[PDB]
Amino acid sequence: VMDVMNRLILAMDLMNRDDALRVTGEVREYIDTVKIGYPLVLSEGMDIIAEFRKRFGCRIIADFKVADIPETNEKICRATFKAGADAIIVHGFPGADSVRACLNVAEEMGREVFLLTEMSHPGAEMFIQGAADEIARMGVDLGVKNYSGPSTRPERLSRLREIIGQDSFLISPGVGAQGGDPGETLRFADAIIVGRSIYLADNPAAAAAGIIESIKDLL
Amino acid sequence: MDVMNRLILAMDLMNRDDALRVTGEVREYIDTVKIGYPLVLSEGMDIIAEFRKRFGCRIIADFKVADIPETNEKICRATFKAGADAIIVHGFPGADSVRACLNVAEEMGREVFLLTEMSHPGAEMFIQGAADEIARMGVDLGVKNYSGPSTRPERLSRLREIIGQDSFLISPGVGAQGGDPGETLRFADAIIVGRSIYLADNPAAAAAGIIESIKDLL
Ligand SMILES: O=c1cnn([C@@H]2O[C@H](COP(=O)(O)O)[C@@H](O)[C@H]2O)c(=O)[nH]1
Ligand SMILES: O=c1cnn([C@@H]2O[C@H](COP(=O)(O)O)[C@@H](O)[C@H]2O)c(=O)[nH]1
DSSP states (O other): OOOOGGGEEEEEOOSSHHHHHHHHHHTTTTOSEEEEEHHHHHHHOTHHHHHHHHHSOOEEEEEEEEOSOHHHHHHHHHHHHHTTOSEEEEESTTOHHHHHHHHHHHHHHTOEEEEEOSOSSGGGGTTHHHHHHHHHHHHHHHTOOEEEOOTTOHHHHHHHHHHHOTTSEEEEOOBSTTSBOHHHHTTTOSEEEEOHHHHTSSSHHHHHHHHHHHTGGGO | OOOGGGEEEEEOOSOHHHHHHHHHHTTTTOSEEEEEHHHHHHHOTHHHHHHHHHHOOEEEEEEEEOSOHHHHHHHHHHHHHTTOSEEEEESTTOHHHHHHHHHHHHHHTOEEEEEOSOSSGGGGTTHHHHHHHHHHHHHHHTOOEEEOOTTOHHHHHHHHHHHOSSSEEEEOOBSTTSBOHHHHTTTOSEEEEOHHHHTSSSHHHHHHHHHHHTGGGO
């Protein structure tokens, strides 16, 4: 599995290149893995991935919530890996063919897929939560090794960990701003994802350091 | 929304030169282009303004928006800043995520299309069973624009029933995925067509052919 420094992944959702680079640089001693999503990519271009690789020694997870038909999913994954992403996040709710399409491209291109199981926001209760255990089981059947699940619902995160097994790699957003606790989340997830609690802080480095101090016995 | 010839081009070529040339070739037949991540991730968001400069066409950003509300808001803002007239949003992530998109669209003078059921085989696993409820959620939220599956006209008809005749309904899966242009237009206001046009030996003839087949439907 990827070796995530300090079990902490930065969700870099600032939408300005200068701010995104400044904040990421400030926390670089604490974090070697950065999740870049569409807020930044749609604002600054896929070349922002290149820029991060150039500036920082960071692994890049493209949080693109891939959620199209197989043919389109293939194209999205190809473009994303071509740009230098180490991994891509993919929805399971569009079904097994859509997921398989991403897995096939990742296998061919030597990169990784993370399957999102249940989302951490309130609206997730409406449809995704009821499908999440089956989505996780589907991932296991398809050979998915990497997953994302919700910090905001420890009971759900625990069940999802059970389904995917201890050997699977599990990351978890919703820590901090959305209400999730770093330590409790790391009972089940391999790494936590943190965005606003760090990138909106007056001192992002102090914020990251504070989170890390709070989980030091788990490192 | 008034779509020329009831035909929306899905421009999923991944090269700027090819995408611009093929769109140019069929410009006399369309005034609405759906641009998705295949093109945007290959050539940048600046491609949207370039399409407007060259063709004056309407632009629907097919970004399958599917994040938490806070992130959805950012995605919609970035997308509308790039000049998109509308954006396609998943309903599966729930009502708050959809509402986030509706907010930005209202703010910037744009439209949200709610995707209810997808057209590929895997849609049967989870989406299809949620689709009627997603459509009702759209109605509850005041959504006026929807997308549904050409490949399942019985499902498309049901979608139409739920949202009513006043709502605007577009439908992908025509051609390559097996859907029929004329049958789909029994229920949808407009059909989306990608590969059957952009991978054709002669895209202009392909477009003309499709239009000829639905001429009695305008
Ligand atoms: O279920 C979820 C919830 N959030 N996110 C993403 O993780 C980050 C959470 O950031 P935050 O710490 O500012 O809440 C954002 O990029 C959000 O899109 C997910 O991928 N899945
Ligand atoms: O349920 C679906 C199926 N396809 N599409 C999109 O519509 C287009 C269909 O293209 P095609 O005519 O080449 O199949 C592609 O951009 C695809 O991502 C959707 O938005 N929803």
